[PDB]
Design a protein around this nucleic acid. Sequence first.
RNA 1: CAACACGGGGAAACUCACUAGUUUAAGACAUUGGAUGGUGAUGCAUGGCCGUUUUUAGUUCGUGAAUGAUUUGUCUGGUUAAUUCCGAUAACGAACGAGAUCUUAACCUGCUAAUUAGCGGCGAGUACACUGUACUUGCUGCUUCUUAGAGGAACAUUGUGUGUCUAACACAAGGAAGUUUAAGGCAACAACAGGUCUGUGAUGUCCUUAGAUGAACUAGGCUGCACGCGUGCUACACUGAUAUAUAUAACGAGUAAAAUAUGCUUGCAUACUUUUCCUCCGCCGAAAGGCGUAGGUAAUCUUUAUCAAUAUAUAUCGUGAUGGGGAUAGAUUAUUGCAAUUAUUAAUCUUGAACGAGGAAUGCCUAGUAAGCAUGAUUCAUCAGAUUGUGCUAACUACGUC
Lengths: 138, 154, 157, 48, 54, 98, 41, 79
Amino acid sequence: KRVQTFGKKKTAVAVATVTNGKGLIKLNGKNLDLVEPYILKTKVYEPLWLIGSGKLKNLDIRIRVKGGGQTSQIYAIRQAIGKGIISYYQKYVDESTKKELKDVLLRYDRSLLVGDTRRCEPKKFGGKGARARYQKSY
Amino acid sequence: RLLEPVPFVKTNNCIKDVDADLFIRSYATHLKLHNKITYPKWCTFVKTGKGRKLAPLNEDWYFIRASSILRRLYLHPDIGVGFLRRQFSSKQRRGVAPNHTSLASGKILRSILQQLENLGYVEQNPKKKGRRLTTKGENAINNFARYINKKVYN
Amino acid sequence: PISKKRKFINDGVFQAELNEFLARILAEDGYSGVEVRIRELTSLVQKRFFLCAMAQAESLRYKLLKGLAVRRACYGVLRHIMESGAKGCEVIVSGKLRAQRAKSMKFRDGYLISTGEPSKRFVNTATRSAQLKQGVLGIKVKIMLPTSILPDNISVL
Amino acid sequence: VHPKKYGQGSRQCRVCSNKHAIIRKYNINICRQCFRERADIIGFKKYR
Amino acid sequence: RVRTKTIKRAARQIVEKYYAKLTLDFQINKKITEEVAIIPSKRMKNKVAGFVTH
Amino acid sequence: IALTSKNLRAIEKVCSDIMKGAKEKNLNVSGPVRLPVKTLRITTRKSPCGEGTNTWDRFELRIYKRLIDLYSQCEVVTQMTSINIDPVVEVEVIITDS
Amino acid sequence: KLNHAVFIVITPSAIAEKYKVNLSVARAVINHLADSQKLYT
Amino acid sequence: YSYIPKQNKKLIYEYLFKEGVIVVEKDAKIPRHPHLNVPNLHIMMTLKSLKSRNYVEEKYNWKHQYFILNNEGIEYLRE
RNA sequence: CAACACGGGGAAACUCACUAGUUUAAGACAUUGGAUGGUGAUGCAUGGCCGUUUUUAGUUCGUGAAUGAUUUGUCUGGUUAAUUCCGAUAACGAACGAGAUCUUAACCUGCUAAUUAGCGGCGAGUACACUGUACUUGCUGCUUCUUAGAGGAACAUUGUGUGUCUAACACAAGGAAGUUUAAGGCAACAACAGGUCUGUGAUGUCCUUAGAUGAACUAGGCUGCACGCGUGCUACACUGAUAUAUAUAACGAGUAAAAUAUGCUUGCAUACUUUUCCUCCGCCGAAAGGCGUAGGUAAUCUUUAUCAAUAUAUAUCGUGAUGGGGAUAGAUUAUUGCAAUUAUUAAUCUUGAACGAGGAAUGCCUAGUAAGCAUGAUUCAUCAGAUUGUGCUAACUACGUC
């Protein structure tokens, strides 16, 4: 049927909806390629290349990305696709197959599975930066 | 360049299925060729917005502006002039003073919107507050989007 | 008509004025709450609007003001505070103190914590101005109350 | 007299009548030094 | 990093009154400290349980 | 009823008491709706005067809003609420037919 | 100082190096030859 | 000049007797009291004098006087 | 240092104390005497609050012991973020500080919950395919994601090394998280004649009080300039400028004066409307900006499944004080205000200075930081190059030593 999940890097959130379909993937109303930077494009195609083209051919994927900037969105998308594929195989397909798939993703990178939790250190008075200070002089 | 190998299934049914720029340039070129919307003459002497602080310096830009606006209208179905002014805003170097974004010139925007509206592309309503896209335009934009997608792809 | 943000600030400011107004009035008694004697005060505020640290400190300044010896008064108050079951107490007196050079004098007893949120949680604190002949004396009282629990203590029966 | 209902001389602290350093955010109308004396009972607690 | 007097002292007191129940698992020890001790913070209870386990 | 306060624990106590009160009488409540917390933050210079280092403290007034829509006779629910509140909880009317 | 002019690897720098041309003129030569930076033929 | 009408003085005295108390408010360029449509400067002048004669006591808090009559004052004001 | 974008001090007026002057009574009381007020004098008379000492790790007692001030306890050593622990040990036992507590931010409860949040369910079209996909109006199980309550979760857990093998550390693994998970907040004792009476109706004394240092009004001035020193801003170009296009952010913040009618005469007086805050939106304006309207007292409207700029892509220059650089000046029409000249601010055309990577010197900084890029808020009638928040773009170099 359908499973819904997310990815979260910095202040970005990317919701992934993994349903029964044919291999159509959209990002909001718009096709998956239409995200712009060619270098970071490859990062979002990266899980498709680790898993081949057959697995997506049974499933349609819809993605909703809100918040955060450019780099943050790309990682959140990458993370959400990961979390989506693996979660769908745990509810619907098969736990052993899912474990094999999870092993392939883990073997490549843990960043796909679970987002980096780095976030801002607050500004503190006495300087423009988070820790940086005004120039002192004698 | 424009074509690349793809690892998923494209749909090609809408403007949301094709890259902004190719659609925009072709539609702008088509619009000027057809001659549906005027230049108009006074528009060559003014700037797009104050962040430019220079002439627009690119000749065919008015058709491009119309083309982008039309696309924005399919993207976001209810908007007014302020949305456009904010959209086309960019940064203004204030000389010694810091930068700020500064809004796009509203007459040229207002005129484009009005010409499209006259030609049945876009529509002022109370049911949805501002300008929306309207039916002759919706059909044309969708169809032109298909025509371009096929023509570019193979 | 007004917003919730506006409502909350006005409520707070009204409290602050009333608190200072209680301070101007309340030299004739201790502390016995407020009602949300009473006829005139109610009339004024309605006309306008349409162990206890404060008590100990108020008592202490009245004793000091009456010109009783400073040590005797401090000791009397401190001993009374401890008598009332205080886990600790500190009374500070600042200003001229029978000389032409200003000074302070500390009178501490008991645990009397000072660091972190247990300090805010268990210590009640009070400031009082005693005007005497050559200017003003500052009373600052700190009382550490009966305790919930004090977080450091760990023990087993 | 010739007051103005705008600008610096138009207004003053609700508690102390200083013309300077007044918080008009949220319409408090109190000077910041006075505000520090009242800051707990109004509800503007410190945390982080 | 280490453990302060309050922690160590408590750690010694537990065992003193409950050695027989206490055992070589941290989670079981933590369960025992939660039952026995009067400590008000999670982090502190865990810290005591860890040191009693040690 | 809609409950607005600057005391979390007081609002929570009110929430539980009206919830129990209603559930005796089988009344239709739509389960506690916690609104986004608004904080009134004031950023204050320390020292009444300039001297010494520039040192700031950041004050926060955190206001709690919570919401329950209810289908019943008004009078009993307001009377149950109004007597059970502490005055730090500000109670406002909301009512439905379903 | 410039000493490059109008008349007589497809990078602009290579063309400028080989024929001693300004980079807009180097670009003009590239465009003529063929019939910011991006994939090559 | 700066006269205060005989009726106005009587009304201020009467108000003070009727209530028992008056919240004058310190500022003098505010034109009326909410419950007396009387020049605040005049009310302030008479209260200052009355306190000086010792028939009315003021507590005072920021911007507000809080005047309560002495018992001798309460009797005196009637005539 | 611990003064010098500090006195929230971004002063057109007022603010204001000052300069040139002009007024006023707002001189209580029992004419007369008599005060009251004072951004007047005194922080080396003082209260309060705050800075430093110092956010380091220090400080103190009971009893004991060693003519006295005193010293021991509170230490050769190991260890640590830490008079933190261990260990030794004429001291044993304590207490405050510190840790701890508290606020955020970090992860999980398929429990707790659905409004002004989402998600589906389902009608209905518009569009394309093709035995669904995109797009809008109407009704209405779910709670994964939006929100926020309660509660869980790490203790160095396991393994391996080093360590009196003691306190403990090191590495690897596990794990949402391993530098007490990251960040704050809180601030002992004893000080400093540190700072503040220009925050206070906190306040002593000393001064002053109708030819006032009170209150108040008009100008002028705090911004002037042979010249010396701070903190910032903007640059010196091609990993760039210029011009189009595309993508995409978080914290927020928002309500006794205006206008129409009447009586007197456009002036004055009175009534009525509904007026001051955010502006969507529709018209008009090159632009500034205007006019007309609409919703918002706010998870509801401004506005947010999108409000920024650095992004990135495609064009145009083509290294030349150059189309770099925007100081400087000249001419404008707007906008705020009683008042804009010493150009308030705004746009528009023209005008085109130094500056070729900075001597001697000297500052900040260790991971979502630094740097770069913005932006919200504070003051605000009007005024960010300031401060304070907040994000996005995400480096270098260790990971230690005296």
